[model samples]
Target: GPTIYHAKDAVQTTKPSERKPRLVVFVVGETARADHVQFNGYGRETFPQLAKVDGLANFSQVTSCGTSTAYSVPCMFSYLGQDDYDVDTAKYQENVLDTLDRLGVGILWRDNNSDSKGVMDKLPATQYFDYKSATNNTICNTNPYNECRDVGMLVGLDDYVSANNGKDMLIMLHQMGNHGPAYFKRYDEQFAKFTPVCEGNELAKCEHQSLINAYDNALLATDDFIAKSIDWLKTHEANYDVAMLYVSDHGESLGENGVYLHGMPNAFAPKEQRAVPAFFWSNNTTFKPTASDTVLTHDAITPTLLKLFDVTAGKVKDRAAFIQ
Candidate 1:
């Protein structure tokens, strides 16, 4: 993928140019089951802030190509079929970052996971000082309860934006949203909108309500992060056309059919684990909002971003190729 560059006066220039948009932000959430997010109608109001964002297309029935982070994250972004997992790991060599780079778009990846295993690693990775050490605070070892509390991962995006003034940039914020085992840690104490935190990730041992509460708290935190970022964008960089797309790398299994975590083979995984949530916000007033019931997978994101940005020259795969 190539990066798109616009002159300082490009936005106002009368000259016909390839770049109409100024910036794109892809926010990736970890282990977020759609059922726990408010936009998806989860019982708790986990996404109060996000719900207020205008022009959000809340796809109610989005599904993942894979069930685990190792497989699903790459598989979703790779140009491969849901059933043809081997194609993703094999034939799909170029990725979103590569495509963006080819198009002249500046890419920045900020990850909270241990060395972002999925499509994130393909881009330039940014490390935050607070999470560099492998302590209980790092996301790699935290349980579900503590995973949401890993809010420190998002500490530096504002500074990055401030430093890079007037440049069109692609920034990806990968949050340790609901990565399990320590769900209790993902959110702050106040966002515990639900009761009875699931002390552990084991679904069988946890009461249904307790598990839901912990997951809901994680969603609340994610909502807050998005809200804060948007607030910053509106106040600090109002001149640039900004858009934020939020989606999960994959969904989680909450003791559904005895499966506690994700990463299972898609064929055997429960629907809950394969089903994920996706929504986007754009400052472009012409961008129409629609609740697309169409069955779309993660792999479609690469092409969607490419098309959305009007980068027509890059080697974009056929969007129809993976829709079936």
Candidate 2:
């Protein structure tokens, strides 16, 4: 049922069609909700750094394909949308990674969560990063991963890029941003600006405001992660055409309608669990400036990425590319 093509000769046979070669950092955010972000209209400026980044397009409204990591992670990577998402097909069909891998694009996946949920199928060059492994590389506190900080995933990224300097590459960084139940542990003490935060995994038992304070703090922490990644890309701008796309696998629920977390069946799930933030940042002036404020389904992600690399159709039917 699957027709994935394996590559040969250092993965050549595909060449860059864009006048400028590209390096895209496609980030997968965990438990990040659209409404909580500052640009998306929550009262606080949780994403301070990205708000000021030049030429960054923050899409105000976007919907996720599913409500849980188990469903949304694979769905986000697949060409299928929620309307007619087929699980059997997902088990045997080619995903966007296959499309890009076939094009000879050097790809790496670094995950700070449990697993990528089969989204890294085509790429063997993956690092299963944890707080221990991450802190071992970067200067970090003893309780690093407890912060569930997204920045840990980027440690030693310079070496990864430098080692594979000659190839057009894509690095997928899966963040632990806003993952809940133990939200208070997600940010450094400096970010504990919010008062009386919930401190335990028993979210339903905590005071509502306390729970939200911790969740928002973790959201704030991700702003630093993204800004730092952009800054890193800027340093290497001369080496490659750099761009970044960020989207959460799905949103989270924090005591909304008596719901404390996500993973509700999509049919009965609230909008809080389905709407996620999707943003784009590029030093390239020609990127889709009109990309903000419009809605995009996760199904469009695969085809849109296909357009970025100028990849073709073979195993999976090509959907319309999102131009931006």
Candidate 3:
């Protein structure tokens, strides 16, 4: 019995035109809630590093597909939106990554969170990197916790961008952002500005304020990771049309009204488990802000990315690409 992917033969209906070289970094964050983000008006300066980054658009009202990484990861990359998502059927179909791969764009996936949840299952071996359990890199692997830092995903990013010069590429960074109940382990010591944080994974055993402190500190690390990635991309401006998009796979409950971790069914899940933070940064493009009352979701991600990469096939809708 040989292993097989159902969409192995997936191919795009039309190819993209030979446009200028572009590099789109899609950072998929884990268990980040919108309410806790500073840009969304949280009291603490959780995103001070990101605040200094020029021209980063923050989408505060963006909602996620599901309450867990297992469902949201694949669902966000699929053509189907939250209402139409079917786990069993989605596995057999090609996602946006596959479509981009089929259309001649080089694809690379690096995961620091749990794996990409089968999002890159159809991509070739050369396109995927598994840092989830990597022991070779000391920057993140030396931690006392069970997971590595989010920056660990960038271990070989510089070389990858250099080698694939003049090619339109997409690099996906799956981050372990604020994944609880072990939030204290997500960030470095310097980022631990918030004192009295909850140390262990037993969230309920810890105080609510301390839990928030740990989670916010982890967010600061995420902010640093993202800002650094953007700064690095800024250096390669001449080689590729560099851009980065960051969005959480799902939100964490953080003991909100008795709820602890994520993975609650969407129908009855609290707002803390549904609302997520999203950001878009482009070196060459400018996107307008969404209306004050407007809402966004993971559904727009695929079409927006396709549009950004110039994948002009009629198979996908515009889905309101943020780039006006």
Best by lDDT: 3
**Model 3 ranges off by over 4 Å:** 1-19, 286-293
TM-score of 2: 0.88
Ranking according to TM-score, highest score first = 3, 2, 1
lDDT of each: 0.62, 0.73, 0.79
Cα RMSD, each candidate: 6.0, 3.5, 3.3
List residue ranges in candidate 2 displaced over 4 A.
Answer: 1-14, 125-148, 314-323
Model 3 TM-score is 0.90
Give the lDDT of residue 60 in candidate 3.
Answer: 74
Q: Encode model 1's per-residue lDDT on 1-324: one tens digit a residue.
A: 432222111121221143443566677778887777666676667778777876566767777777766776666555444555463343235555556654556677666654445454444444222253445234434443333244455455667666665655677666767777677777667687778788764667889778877877778877887776666556544566777677787888777667777777766878788778877777765244344566677766766665545444333345531112
**Pick by lDDT: 1 or 2, better one:** 2
Question: Could you give candidate 2's per-residue lDDT for residues 1-324 as a string of tens digits?
Answer: 355422122222346544556788888888999999988889988888888999888877688888888888888777555666665556455677766766667677877666678766545644444442434435355365533356776777788778777567788888777777788777787777777998877888889889889988888778888888898888878867788888898888888878879999878999999889887888876456435766676776776666566565543344533354
The sequence of per-residue lDDT tens digits that candidate 3 reaches over residues 187-241 is 8888899989998767888989999999999999999999988987888887677
Candidate 2 or 3, higher lDDT?
3
Candidate 3 clashing pairs?
Answer: none
* lDDT (Cα, 0-100) at 141 in candidate 2: 56
